[PDB]
Design a protein around this ligand. Sequence first.
Ligand SMILES: Nc1ncnc2c1ncn2[C@@H]1O[C@H](COP(=O)(O)OP(=O)(O)OP(=O)(O)O)[C@@H](O)[C@H]1O
Ligand SMILES: Nc1ncnc2c1ncn2[C@@H]1O[C@H](COP(=O)(O)OP(=O)(O)O)[C@@H](O)[C@H]1O
Ligand SMILES: Nc1ncnc2c1ncn2[C@@H]1O[C@H](COP(=O)(O)OP(=O)(O)O)[C@@H](O)[C@H]1O
Ligand SMILES: [Mg+2]
Ligand SMILES: [Mg+2]
Ligand SMILES: [Mg+2]
Lengths: 27, 512, 60, 347, 470, 54, 188, 27
Amino acid sequence: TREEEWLDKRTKSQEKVYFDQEDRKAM
Amino acid sequence: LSTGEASVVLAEKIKGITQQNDITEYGTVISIGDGIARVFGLTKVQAGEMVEFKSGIRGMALNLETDNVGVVVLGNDRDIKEGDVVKRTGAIVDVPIGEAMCGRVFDALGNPIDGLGPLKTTQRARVEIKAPGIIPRQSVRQPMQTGIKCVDSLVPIGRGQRELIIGDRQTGKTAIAIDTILNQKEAFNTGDVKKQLYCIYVAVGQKRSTIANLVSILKQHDCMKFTIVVCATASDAAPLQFLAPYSGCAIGEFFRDNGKHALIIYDDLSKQAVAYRQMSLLLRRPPGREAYPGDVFYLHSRLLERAAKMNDSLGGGSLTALPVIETQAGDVSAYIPTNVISITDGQIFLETELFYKGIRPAINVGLSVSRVGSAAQIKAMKKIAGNLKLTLATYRELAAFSQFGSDLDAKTQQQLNTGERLVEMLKQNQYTPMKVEEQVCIIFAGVKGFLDALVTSEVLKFEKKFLEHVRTNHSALLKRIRDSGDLSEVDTNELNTIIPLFIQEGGFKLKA
Amino acid sequence: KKLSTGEASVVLAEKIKGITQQNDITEYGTVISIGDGIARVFGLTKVQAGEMVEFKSGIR
Amino acid sequence: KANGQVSQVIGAVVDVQFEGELPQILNALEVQGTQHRLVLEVAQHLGDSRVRTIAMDSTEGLVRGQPVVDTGLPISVPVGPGTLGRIMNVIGEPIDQRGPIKAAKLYPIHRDAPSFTDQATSAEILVTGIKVVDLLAPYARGGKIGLFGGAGVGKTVLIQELINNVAKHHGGYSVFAGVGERTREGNDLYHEMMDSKVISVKEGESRCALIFGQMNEPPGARARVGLTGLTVAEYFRDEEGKDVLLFVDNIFRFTQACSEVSALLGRIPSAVGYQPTLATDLGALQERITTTQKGSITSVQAIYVPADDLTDPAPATTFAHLDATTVLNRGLTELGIYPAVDPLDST
Amino acid sequence: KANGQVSQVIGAVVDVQFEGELPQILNALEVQGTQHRLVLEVAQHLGDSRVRTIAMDSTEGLVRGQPVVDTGLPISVPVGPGTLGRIMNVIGEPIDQRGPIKAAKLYPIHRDAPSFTDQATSAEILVTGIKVVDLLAPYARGGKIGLFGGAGVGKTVLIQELINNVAKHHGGYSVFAGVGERTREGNDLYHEMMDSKVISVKEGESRCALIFGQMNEPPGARARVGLTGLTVAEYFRDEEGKDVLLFVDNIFRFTQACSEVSALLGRIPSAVGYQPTLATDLGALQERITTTQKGSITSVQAIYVPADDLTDPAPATTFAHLDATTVLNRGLTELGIYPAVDPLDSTSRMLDPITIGEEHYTVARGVQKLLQDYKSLQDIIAILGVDDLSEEDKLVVARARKVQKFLSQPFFMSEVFSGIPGRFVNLKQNIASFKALLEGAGDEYPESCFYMKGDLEESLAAGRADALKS
Amino acid sequence: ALKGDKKAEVLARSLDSAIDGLSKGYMDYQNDPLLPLILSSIEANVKKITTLSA
Amino acid sequence: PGDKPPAIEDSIHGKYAGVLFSSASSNKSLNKVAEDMKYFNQLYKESEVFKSFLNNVSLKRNQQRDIISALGKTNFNPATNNLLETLIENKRLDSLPKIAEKYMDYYRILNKQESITIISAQELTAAEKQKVEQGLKKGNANVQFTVVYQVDPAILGGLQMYSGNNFLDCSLLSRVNKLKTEIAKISF
Amino acid sequence: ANLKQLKIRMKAIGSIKKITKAMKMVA
Ligand SMILES: Nc1ncnc2c1ncn2[C@@H]1O[C@H](COP(=O)(O)OP(=O)(O)OP(=O)(O)O)[C@@H](O)[C@H]1O
Ligand SMILES: Nc1ncnc2c1ncn2[C@@H]1O[C@H](COP(=O)(O)OP(=O)(O)O)[C@@H](O)[C@H]1O
Ligand SMILES: Nc1ncnc2c1ncn2[C@@H]1O[C@H](COP(=O)(O)OP(=O)(O)O)[C@@H](O)[C@H]1O
Ligand SMILES: [Mg+2]
Ligand SMILES: [Mg+2]
Ligand SMILES: [Mg+2]
């Protein structure tokens, strides 16, 4: 029973995917 | 040596036996209960001094009061009665040490319980002795191979540090300790004294049936020849459970001061705190938080702080400690676990969820850490270990997006799959230690991404088949990695070329 | 009971001797124990609660 | 000779003043001049010829200074084939109104645990018929089993099922020990055992012994009733040598009983009020329940989780001594799943 | 001639029976007949010519009736340049095996703090080379500095960097008091200072003192060894107007050690088992560590947070005495950022627009507000994601991540772990670097380059290098 | 030796060696008959085995 | 002897016994108080009514003083009279017997005479015992002592002496065990 | 039962309910 970890992982996961694509365009 | 010459020396030795007896003060017990004996008189007695009762059982004088003396019964206190005689021996608690200790099973006091025969030893060291200073120590720069892939790769343990095996009940805490002892057996067979590691297992508050099963496994694998087992069962009095850790620790100092390498494994210390708490409460001492004594922190600190890497001036010996801690419900915020974590260098967190999800050894790499770091790993390991940590770090992040789904970038799918290969790679069965050189090859194929080709369910078996294929055909490669301890460029090209080749050779599910 | 802090050796010794000399028990007291910044003074009768007292050295 | 005299009576703890030759610890003392004979086990020597003891029966009616006789030996209960099919008391007295028990010898309930040399593995699975149990946490005959559960979760019903599936078909003898439970189950179990033909009045039958320490007994009785039944089991293990099924009802009462009397004995409370000797006292009782070269004892022990707090010291320390574990969850019962076994907690 | 004698021995507490002329409290008593020199500190007068003391060495081997000598003064330790570059014991014994310590005189470890009229407080920026520190929580030369960190968070390695960056090239002397920590770290630091030439065997050199109260020492010694190190710094302060750098290791062990014996001393346990005199015992030490007219002391003391619970009484009371605060967060370590300095919790008394330049104060708050806003977005981003956010919020999250990652700085002490050589960042380059990011100078380049960099220019150069590489 | 069959001298010698210790501050078994008795048996086996290297 | 009792203790009975011994031994007298306290011990155990009086705690101070005066105002050392008055003021009359006994212990420690007990399995012949006296005498040769005999040991032909608080083992049983253990640890 | 953990999980559910309630308004 750990929902705080669920939100934390969701935050890091989605942010990484979003900015990972932006890193390509930035380069 | 001729048989006649040895017999004469044997007879001459029996001739030279001295026995002197001096006046020893004795006192009467004012009261006796729960293993605590209040003694009248018996003055000029030293703290912690050994005393013997009428029946023949020993005792330790801990509380020296102006009125009486508080003594703890080191055994069964049924025969003790009011007014009985208590004779002081005049020597602090000690235990026998030497090489004959290997291959036997002793108790907290040091008596062998195997039933084979009496202990043939002449050296006895004090149980509690001041730890080494700052100068005698030395930087830890030698690896202590445990045989586990995840441990030897992510959490390297160097000879002379202190690693904490922390977890909940039935989380594989004992499984890790057994795998380490089994791995050191190979180094013992080969004539490499610089890598021999004597194993010491301290059992505190454990059912004898479990310890019996433990010893049988060692004999089964022939790993008991270099193992020492100290037993402090639940039926044993609390002082025995309190001294067994320090008792076995003194046995390790023998190999330490003699330039040798010894590995001591302290079982759950929470049981020691209960025995130490019980011993303190029955002495009418003021209790602290959670009913434990105030100096409970000094207990584990004094015990673990002795493990160190002696400098070359004293022989270069080392003593490695692997204390274990059992958590109630995975709560590491408790008092005892918090203290032990701050005392040791690194700690291995075991998770119950990972255990049931097939991740065995259930190791949480996110929290585990080691102060020595790459300073202990070999050249061929540091290079591959660094990239392994980064890859696993990203995989834990993308774990959430897997549920999100609905889309997956080309690279994310690779990183997601690549990490899955490593997790499936680090898994290891029970009683199956792996050689350091073999791990380098398998761990290498994982980070490079070759495991992404075959299906995950076939990665575990691929490990076995790959290693066997290497040992037979590619034997010179393993020798170079072992002797030199470095992964040269020539080995990389050869290894980098056979790993994709072998996957195509063997019959596997190539469809990712 | 266990013991009474007022049963010091100095005070009990005076009783056994039989000499009824307290050296102006009123307005004066003798320190019996000192610990953690709190010193218990025997005697010193007629002292009001929360009242200032002067020690031998001079501190209040 | 009545060398002892009641010094003070405090609940279940009674002190006795002797003139000389104090009894050893754990020795049994009998008070004189009181119906329903009271047995007192020596626990501590307070000094000045005063010894502190625990009462097995209600202490109401005792008078300070009443004489006390010293038996010189610990509580000795009858053991042998006579106890088979017979209900005994914490002090070995029969409470089934069946007559005197025919026992060859009387063994003391206080004995040291088997040594390290006399130990056997006996790694053989025990098929109980329950799929959830045999799948996740399969029981092995000759090993220790532990049933953890809260108030009204299915511990008793689970014990009854095992007795119906295992005890009946079992070949060797059996021993049932109840510690701090409702007497109704003891009566229903006894009559149910007779109806099933598992036990009968005819000599040579009833390969099972019954022991009861129901709640009606005061403190000290529920803490030593287990030793009484356990001694009956050790006899069959060593002397008879055949397999034994030692059914032990909720044992938390034992540890609780010690805590109920520890405060009276002058012991400092533990973290959450328990006695400081919980580990040692429980260990001496647990180390004796083990399989050896003479015989095997498959023990099914129930553990009551106080307030459903598995982190409590009493149940937590019990896990280390158990081989097979079956933790019962109340959440499953609410859903209607029976047996409410937690597969992720049943190790 | 010994007047006292041992009467009671339980654990680390030892009682002495005196015949006359009882020793004052805090006095040092010498027990005769012990294999090692044992010193007892008078703590309480129990009456009947009885005194309760705490043992500095292991009480094993003592005997009731053993004669005890009264020194007539508290524990006196050698002071002066002779202690520079040498390890010393709680009672002044040299445990470095380099011989006896030469001291012009002996000062007591117990003394009254300086008066209020002669406080002479002053604020002066201390360029420690760490950009995250010099920006958000600037340090003041001569003021206390607190490093709040949990178990295995990186506070020990951070102290080593401050020494490597601050201790060296310092005109004045430095003192290092390590209490309660493991001895392994002590040997490493000793060898480190020797290799780094901070300490040497040649006399007239080694402008740095080392004091160790590691775990191997028993209770009582770990609670007073800290006072020994302070006395050395006080000597270098009063006798010479030289700035002293006091590097104190984890101090929670001090309050912890007192609680280990507080029970046996007779005190009633506190809410969390600590001694009732926690505030007073800590206040007597903090008040003594301060700048005065004679000299100044820049004390860098670390506070161990057990179980990452900042509400514990011990650290809670310490916040009131500290000038600069550095709270370490465990979440950052999981992300890989080092030093894991919590930007929001960490504060500095020097963080005032009047004290420091307005530009420095502006850039500081600009980063704090940026990170605070990004934290609130984490909630909605978890369910909806960054895509569902507005263009305004996207830029906030974008720059916030780049600034957060840019805070990470590799130091020399972390090379063995990471493998990248340490780097030093100036205050001017630090403020200018973050000021540009707040304006969007680096919003174009990827956030990957703004990680473990010293200056913004280094990040831009790495960005261009990655382009030509692909 | 603990049994009969000429055990008298063993006890008689033990008494003599006992009073010697009592009269002195400590007790040493220089005159105990157990040690020479054991050595005699051991020396017999040594002589028996010590015949020649062959 | 320096008005310092043999030992110092914080116990209730120990505290009063020490102060009395020191105060008594201070001026001139120690035996006078010893006989006084000994009288209370004999009367405390012989007269039942006297025992209930001391144990009685609900009695008033003024009432206790009157009954004590009725017992006797003379033949008791002033230290004893002042001791009783102190107990009545501190309600410590119930602890009177323990104080009396404890006081005698200290006085018995000052006594030079000591009892030596010899433990032997075989019966000690008249001629043999005579030799034992010369050994014990020559051992000390500076203090008179009384010898006591007790023969019920488990050892055989062994001698074990108990002299007040010292123990010296001359038993043959100790010799047997020592050799059997060393012969086992030969480690040939 | 480790109040620190429970209070954190309560905070998480509070935010979820908040964001969950807000999404309904936009819905
Ligand atoms: N790596 C593993 N691989 C396969 N099986 C395992 C592994 N680890 C544990 N098991 C199984 O878990 C059970 C024992 O677990 P283990 O004793 O190793 O953990 P533990 O923490 O020491 O338990 P406890 O705290 O009760 O002593 C056994 O059933 C074992 O087969
Ligand atoms: N700058 C760093 N960068 C990355 N990892 C680090 C860094 N510093 C420490 N680690 C890790 O921190 C651990 C040491 O923690 P430590 O500073 O000793 O905490 P504590 O002060 O409580 O002892 C080491 O395992 C080390 O690998
Ligand atoms: N196998 C079962 N199947 C369905 N219902 C059950 C089952 N076992 C118990 N119930 C219900 O659970 C309740 C509690 O079971 P019980 O064993 O008596 O708990 P306790 O340990 O407190 O005695 C029973 O009264 C019974 O009504
Ligand atoms: Mg285990
Ligand atoms: Mg039930
Ligand atoms: Mg640290």
